């Protein structure tokens, strides 16, 4: 009966909040002060949380799921009843964890040695990522691109084939058709009177939104190709694809390292307020106190006053071994801490606004039950953090926060320099993200057999992304598995939808703050009505369907690409005038070796 499930969850909601607390408090003491008497302090305290949750999970199947009427207590029950693994045979369950540990340690400890000196050998993160991000030598970028895929990616090919079979068995025992349908279960919504969403409906909404970005991406692809021919003459065709090893990093995920070759007006400095911070003696604490004044300006609460003692805003005065990585912690019981090692720079002035945005999202849904204290889907949590960073990087906000000469002149040449640096990171990553999840979805359902994995991968690079390989690759390579998110078992569609939600939030908040100009000049400071539009979504958590959360801000029930294109229309107008003598589009027949 349904009233027994309510009494089940309230014993759960008070044993979990304490056991999650000290399992996360011990993870704080390891992260900010590393010993090994802290790693053993967090492994036993971490396993008491994991052993407790599988005990309550096997108690949750005593209650049926379709004999429930209240939507909230049904949502908590389905998130706890989830079997996930453990549906496999107990010798297949240990084979899967052996593969996931072997693929993870090949990626982090794989070395590449030089053919002129076999005694010098580079790892990926120090040394191989620096060549792909800084070099202008064609022959050295071609060496680092091919040798990472032929010496490390060939080890992951027999391991990734066994990984697909075991993950499809686990997904079909949980009544999905494949493992790709298991990943799309985040966006599913069942029976809330007009707000429903199918797991197959996500596939059409991604492909419908993508064919409206292809006019903008084609003009960006044509402008970068014309600028790369001056940097690498006799290597690039003026009507063809771009070679895969000249894109700024190892995989071509972000084009953000191509800015020094593709800058529109290099005689205008892109605005940088780092010298005005060290001329006014701003400490470590000023960067957060101006960040807290931004959020109280819009109508959001202060920091919790436990935030100022418990947090560790710099690396300590001790030479203290403590993972230095910006992050926002939500230990529980209303205890919010930020861990970062901040330097006096406009870079960490902006990520301070980003990391505080995770905190203000966390402080808002802290009145829901324990199992609904996440973002409404996997994409909302990063998207609310980045609309705080866009509004703080504007020169309108910088001159009113005291950091820009009240006699500063923004010219139309510097807005093109700023918008093109945004499009190399935002627009340049959208066909990479769409192509990769489309390839992984077709591998799991079996539309691509294993004798055509690397054949269909490079046909989709030339057609969707416009990127050609420099050396042909047969079915002994596995080039997707040489990325971190593929070999470490992570979903990748959250980076596509976060980019679309980010400009839907920003365009909906600037109509409430009564903006008049272009969308990229907007700032939501001093408003109250925009914050009330934002706070009505922030407090929902997972208690409502995410389509119901979007109408509280945007006014629509689906993700939309038209606010993303309105942000880049000053660039799209300027790009169509720079490509009057160029060719827009590419040919899938040209190759850098096929002459």
């Amino acid at each position: 009966i349904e009233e027994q499930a309510k009494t089940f969850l309230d014993k759960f909601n008070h044993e979990a909040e304490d056991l999650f607390y000290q399992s996360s408090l011990a993870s704080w003491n390891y992260n900010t002060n590393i010993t090994e008497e802290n790693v053993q302090n967090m492994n036993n305290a971490g396993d008491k949380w994991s052993a407790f949750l599988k005990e309550q999970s096997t108690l949750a199947q005593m209650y049926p799921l379709q004999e429930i009427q209240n939507l909230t207590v049904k949502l908590q029950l389905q998130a706890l009843q989830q079997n996930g693994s453990s549906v496999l045979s107990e010798d297949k369950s240990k084979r899967l964890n052996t593969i996931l540990n072997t693929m993870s340690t090949i990626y982090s400890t794989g070395k590449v040695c030089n053919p002129d000196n076999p005694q010098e050998c580079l790892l990926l993160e120090p040394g191989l990522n620096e060549i792909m991000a800084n070099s202008l030598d064609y022959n050295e970028r071609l060496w680092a691109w091919e040798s990472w895929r032929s010496e490390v990616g060939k080890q992951l090919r027999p391991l990734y084939e066994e990984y697909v079979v075991l993950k499809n068995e686990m997904a079909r025992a949980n009544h999905y058709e494949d493992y790709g349908d298991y990943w799309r279960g985040d966006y599913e919504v069942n029976g809330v009177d007009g707000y429903d969403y199918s797991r197959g409906q996500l596939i059409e909404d991604v492909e419908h939104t993508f064919e409206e970005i292809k006019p903008l991406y084609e003009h960006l692809h044509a402008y970068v190709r014309a600028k790369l021919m001056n940097a690498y003459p006799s290597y690039i065709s003026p009507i063809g694809c771009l070679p895969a090893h000249l894109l700024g990093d190892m995989w071509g995920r972000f084009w953000t390292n191509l800015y020094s070759l593709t800058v529109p007006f290099g005689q205008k400095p892109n605005i940088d307020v780092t010298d005005a911070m060290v001329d006014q003696a701003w400490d470590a604490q000023r960067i957060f106190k101006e960040a807290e004044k931004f959020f109280v300006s819009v109508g959001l609460p202060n920091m919790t006053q436990g935030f100022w003692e418990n947090s560790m805003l710099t690396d300590p005065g001790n030479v203290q071994k403590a993972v230095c990585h910006p992050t926002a912690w939500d230990l529980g019981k209303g205890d919010f801490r930020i861990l970062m090692c901040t330097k006096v720079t406009m870079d960490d002035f902006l990520t301070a606004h980003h990391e505080m945005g995770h905190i203000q999202y966390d402080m808002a849904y802290a009145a829901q039950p324990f199992l609904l204290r996440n973002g409404a889907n996997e994409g909302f949590h990063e998207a609310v953090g980045e609309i705080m960073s866009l509004s703080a990087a504007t020169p309108k906000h910088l001159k009113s926060i005291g950091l820009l000469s009240p006699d500063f002149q923004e010219d139309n040449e510097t807005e093109i320099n700023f918008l093109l640096k945004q499009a190399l990171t935002i627009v340049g990553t959208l066909p990479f993200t769409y192509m990769l999840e489309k390839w992984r979805w077709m591998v799991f359902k079996g539309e691509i057999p294993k004798d055509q994995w690397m054949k269909k991968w490079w046909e989709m690079k030339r057609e969707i992304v416009g990127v050609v390989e420099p050396v042909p690759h047969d079915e002994t390579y596995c080039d997707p598995a040489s990325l971190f998110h593929v070999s470490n078992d992570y979903s990748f569609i959250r980076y596509y939808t976060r980019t679309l939600y980010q400009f839907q939030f920003q365009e909906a908040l600037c109509q409430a703050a009564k903006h008049e100009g272009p969308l990229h000049k907007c700032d939501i400071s001093n408003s109250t009505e925009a914050g009330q539009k934002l706070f009505n979504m922030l407090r929902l958590g997972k208690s409502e369907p995410w389509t119901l959360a979007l109408e509280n801000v945007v006014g629509a029930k689906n993700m939309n690409v038209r606010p993303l294109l309105n942000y880049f229309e000053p660039l799209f107008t300027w790009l169509k005038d720079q490509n009057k003598n160029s060719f827009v589009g590419w040919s899938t027949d040209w190759s850098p070796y096929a002459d």
């Binding site: 009966i1 009233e3 027994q4 009494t7 089940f8 309230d10 014993k11 008070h14 304490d18 607390y21 000290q22 408090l25 108690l59 005593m62 919790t304 006053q305 436990g306 418990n310 019981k333 209303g334 205890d335 919010f336």
Partner: protein, 98 residues
């Protein structure tokens, strides 16, 4: 490490009458199945403990409460405020209260 000595009751058959008190420790029975004094599904111990810890956000830290309740049965009198006394003047027509 958590002060686990401060408990509260989280299951009862029926809400309390005003100023009523209940220190029993019988195993609660949520479902219809009888419990027979042992724990299990739908048979819960009725007391939980605040695990208080010094690094808790406000609203999670312990507050001490005192409830004063003045009652007036039908006696002849009892405790009350304090009566202050001022100075006394002499040889002047005055308005006095002794």
């Amino acid at each position: 490490g958590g002060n686990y000595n401060y408990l509260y009751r989280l299951f009862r058959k029926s809400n309390l009458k005003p100023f009523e008190r209940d220190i029993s420790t019988e195993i609660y029975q949520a479902g219809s199945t009888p419990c027979n004094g042992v724990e299990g599904f739908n048979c819960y111990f009725p007391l939980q403990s605040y695990g208080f810890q010094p690094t808790n956000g406000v609203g999670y830290q312990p507050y001490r409460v005192v409830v004063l309740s003045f009652e007036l049965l039908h006696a002849p009198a009892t405790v009350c405020g304090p009566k202050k006394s001022t100075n006394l003047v002499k040889n002047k027509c005055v308005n006095f209260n002794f």
